[PDB]
C-alpha cells in the first residue's frame, strides 16, 4: 500500500508555503525544505504532467505563484499521480473558497492542512475525489 511519496505545494522558489510528508524520509525542516527546493528546481519552468526527479515520477502543475506537487513512484505514470495532484488542486480550491495561490493557502492555513491529510494518508492515497474531501473537512 503506497503510491504517493509526498505532497508539496510550493511557492515559485521551492520554499515551504506547504509540504506534508507522506514519506518518513522528511520530518526535519531542513531536509523537508531541501526536498521542496529540489523538486521545484527540476520541475519548474517546464510545465508538464511528467518530470522525473530522484528516480521517482513527479507530477506537478502550476498556478499564478505556486507549483503543486505529488511525488509518487515511476513504475506508474503521470496520470495515476495526476489524479492525486488534480484532487489536491481542486479540493484546496473548493475548500478555501478561492483558487490555490499563496494568498488562498495563507488565508486559510487550517483548510489547507486538513484537506491534504484527507487526500494522502502515510503515502497511500486515501482520497482522490475533490468533493468528498471538501465535505469531509470543516473550515
Amino acid at each position: 500500500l503506497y503510491t504517493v511519496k509526498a505532497i508539496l505545494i510550493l511557492d515559485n522558489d521551492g520554499d515551504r508555503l506547504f509540504a506534508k510528508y507522506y514519506d518518513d524520509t522528511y520530518p526535519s525542516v531542513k531536509e523537508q525544505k531541501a526536498f521542496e527546493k529540489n523538486i521545484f528546481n527540476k520541475t519548474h519552468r517546464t510545465d508538464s504532467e511528467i518530470a522525473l526527479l530522484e528516480g521517482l515520477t513527479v507530477v506537478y502543475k502550476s498556478s499564478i505563484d505556486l507549483y503543486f506537487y505529488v511525488i509518487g513512484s515511476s513504475y506508474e505514470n503521470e496520470l495515476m499521480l495526476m489524479a492525486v495532484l488534480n484532487c489536491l488542486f481542486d479540493s484546496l480550491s473548493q475548500m478555501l473558497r478561492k483558487n490555490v495561490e499563496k494568498r488562498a493557502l495563507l488565508e486559510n492555513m487550517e483548510g489547507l492542512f486538513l484537506a491534504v491529510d484527507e487526500i494522502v494518508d502515510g503515502g497511500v492515497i486515501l482520497e482522490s475525489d475533490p468533493q468528498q474531501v471538501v465535505h469531509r473537512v470543516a473550515l
Binding site: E49, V124, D129
Partner: protein
Amino acid sequence: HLEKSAVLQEARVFNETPINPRKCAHILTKILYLINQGEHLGTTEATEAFFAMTKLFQSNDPTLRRMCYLTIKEMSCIAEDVIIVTSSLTKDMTGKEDNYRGPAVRALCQITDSTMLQAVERYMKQAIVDKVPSVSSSALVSSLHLLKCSFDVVKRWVNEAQEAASSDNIMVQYHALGLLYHVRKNDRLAVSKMISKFTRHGLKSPFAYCMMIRVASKQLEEEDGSRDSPLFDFIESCLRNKHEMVVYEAASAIVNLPGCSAKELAPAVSVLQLFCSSPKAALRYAAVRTLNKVAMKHPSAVTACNLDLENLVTDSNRSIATLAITTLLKTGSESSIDRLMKQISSFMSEISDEFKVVVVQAISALCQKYPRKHAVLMNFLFTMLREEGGFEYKRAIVDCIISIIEENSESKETGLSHLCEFIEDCEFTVLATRILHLLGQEGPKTNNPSKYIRFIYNRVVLEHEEVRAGAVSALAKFGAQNEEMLPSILVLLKRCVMDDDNEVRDRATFYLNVLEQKQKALNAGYILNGLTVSIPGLEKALQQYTLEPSQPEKVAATRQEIFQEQLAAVPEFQGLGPLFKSSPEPVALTESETEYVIRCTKHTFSDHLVFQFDCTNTLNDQTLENVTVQMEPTEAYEVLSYVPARSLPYNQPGTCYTLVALPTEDPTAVACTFSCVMKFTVKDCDPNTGEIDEEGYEDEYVLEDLEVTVADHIQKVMKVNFEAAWDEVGDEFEKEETFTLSTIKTLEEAVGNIVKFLGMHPCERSDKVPENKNTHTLLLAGVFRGGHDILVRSRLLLLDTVTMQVTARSSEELPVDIILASVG
C-alpha cells in the same frame, strides 16, 4: 509565520476549565502551522499541550474534531500520558458523518497500541465495510498500522477487509486488497485465495490493479486452492483496462515471465501491450517503454522509437527530455546500442551542463555494458576526457586505469599523453594523476616517455599536493621497473615541486631514499606493474544510468569428497572403513519447509556405510535438542553408532549421522531399505530462528525411509577392453544368474537399468546397443567399496522381452552376489 513556544504554551488553559472550541481550534491550527511552515516543538510545552487538548474532545464540533486528529498525531510522540485520548477518539469514531468517522480511526489507531487494540475493534469493523471511501479506506490504512502493535486483532478484520475488496470503487478496493495481502498472510496460499477471488474481474480501479500487480507479478498457481494457470484476468497479464501505467507494469513482467500467456484481446508474451498505448502525450512515458519483452527489448524497441527519439532530440525542456532519455534507455539492448549511442551523443546538445558529463560517460558506459568493443569504450573514455576535462574525478582515474589494463594500456597512456597537452593546471589533479600513473606503470616504449614526462612536469608545479606526491612515488616505481628511467627521476625529484613541498616531500623522502640509497629490493618488490591503489568494479555505467534523465573457492567437485569432508570431521567414519564413495543418488527424506527438511545421503566405506542426515527443524513452535535419526535396517547390517545433531532450532540445519557396518558375505543385495525416525527433545520456542523454554517434552517426528542402492556401493567407470578386466577381477568369485526383464522390450533400456541400479558405467558405451538385435554382450564396470573392482557381463537375448544371463565377477564374493540380487 509563528513562534512554537507561544503557541505550545497558551494551549495549557484547556487543561483547566476553559474549553472554548473557537479559541482552542485556532491554537491547534497554529500547532499544525508550526510544523507545516517548518519548526520543531519544544517537549515540555508539547507534553502539557497534549494533556490539555483531551478536555477539548468533550465538545463535538466538526472543525475542532478535525484539528484534534491532526494535532494529536503530530504531537503524539513528543508528549506524555497520551493514553487518555483513546476514549475520546472512540466516542468521536462512532459518531456518524465522514468528518468524524474517517479522520478519527486514523488518529486513534496511530496512538493505539496492542493493549488498546481490543477497544477500537467494534468501531473498526463498522468503519472498514463502508463503501463510503473515506471511512473504509482510513479504517483499512489504519489496520495496516495496527498490524505492528498487535497482528491478531487485525487479522480478525480480514472478513470486513474482503467485504470492502468486492467494491469496484477505487479506494475501497485498493485499500481492501492491499491491506488484505499484508494481513491474512500466514502462508502464501491464504493470500493467494484472497487474490484469486478478485482476480476474475475487469476492475475500473487502476490503483487496485497496480497494488495487486505487484503481488501477482510472480507466477501464482495456488490461488484459491489451485488453478491450472498463473492467470490474472485483471490487468497484470490482461489488458482489460487501458491506462498507460497499469499497461506498462503488466506488459514488462508478463512478456518473458508469464502471469499468463498472450491472448488476442490481452497480449502477454507478445511485445504489443505497451506499444498500442505508445504514441501519446506526456502520458506516453509509461506507454512507450519496454523492459524484458519477447525475446529481447529490441523488436519491441522499434515500435515506440519514433516517440522516444523525437522528444529526446527536440525537447530541451528538462521534464520532457528526461522521459525521452529513460524511454530510449528502456527500448535499448545489446543490438539497440548503435542507435542508443548516436542518440545519447545528440542528447547533451539539448541539456548540457552535468548532462554533458553524463552523455560522454554514457556513450563509454553503453559501450562497456552492451559491447561495441572494449577499444571503442577507451576511445569514448578519451572523448569524455576531452570534453569535460574535470568532471572525470578520482574514481575515474582508478576505474579508467583498471579497466584499461584489460587491453588498452599502451594506447591509453599515449592518448592520455595527448590529452594532457590540454591545460596546465585546470585539467585537474586527476588527469595528471592518470597520465602519471599510466606512464609510470606501462613505462612507455610505445611512445617516448620524454613527452609524457615533460607534460606531467609542468602540471605538477601548479596542481594539488596529492598528484605531486603521486608523481614522486610513481617515478620511483618507474625507476625500479625500467633502468633507463632513473636519469629523469633524478632531474624531477631534486626540484622543489616533485619533492620539497609538504606531503610531496615526505613521500618523496621515503620513495627517493629507497630508490637512491637503498637496495631496491623494496622498490622492485613494490612494482608488480605499478598498478593502482585499489581495483573496484566498473562503477560508471550504473551511475550514468540513473544520472542521465534526472573469492568463492571450492575443495570438492564430487559428491564423495564433500560428504567425505563432512564425515572426516567425525572420527568414527574414517576409523571404521575409509570412504570409497558417497551416493550419486542422495534421497531427501522429508520435504523443504514443512515440518522437517531432512536430506539423507548414504556413504560407503570399505566395510561400512555412514548415513549423514542433514536435519532441519522447521517447526515454528519448537526448538529441538539432542536430535538423532534412528535406523532399522531391513537386512543384516549392524547399527554401530549414532552421532546426534546437537540442537535443531527453528529453520536451522544440523547434521546427525548413523554408522552401520556393511555385510561382506550377503547373498542378497546391499540395496537395502532403512526405516528412519528422528527422535528428539522439544523445548518450546517462540518462532524467530530459535529460543528454548525452561522445561519441555520428548517428541518424535516420523521420517521417510532411506534406500541404499548398489549404485551407492559402486562408482562407475568404463574399460577399454572389458574382457581382460572382466577375467582379471576374479572368476573365482564368479556366479551367474538369469533374469527376465519383461518390463523392458529392447537392449538399450535394459543396459540402462543394470547401469543405474548397480552404479556401473557400461563399458565401451554399451548403453547404445544395435536396435532390436538378437544377441548382445553388455560389459559393465565400476569399482565397489573397499576399492575393489566389480565387473558384470550381461549377455542379452531379445525375444519380445529381454532375458539376460548375468555373470559377475569381482575381487570378492559380495559385489557379485549384490549385483546379481539387485538386478533380479
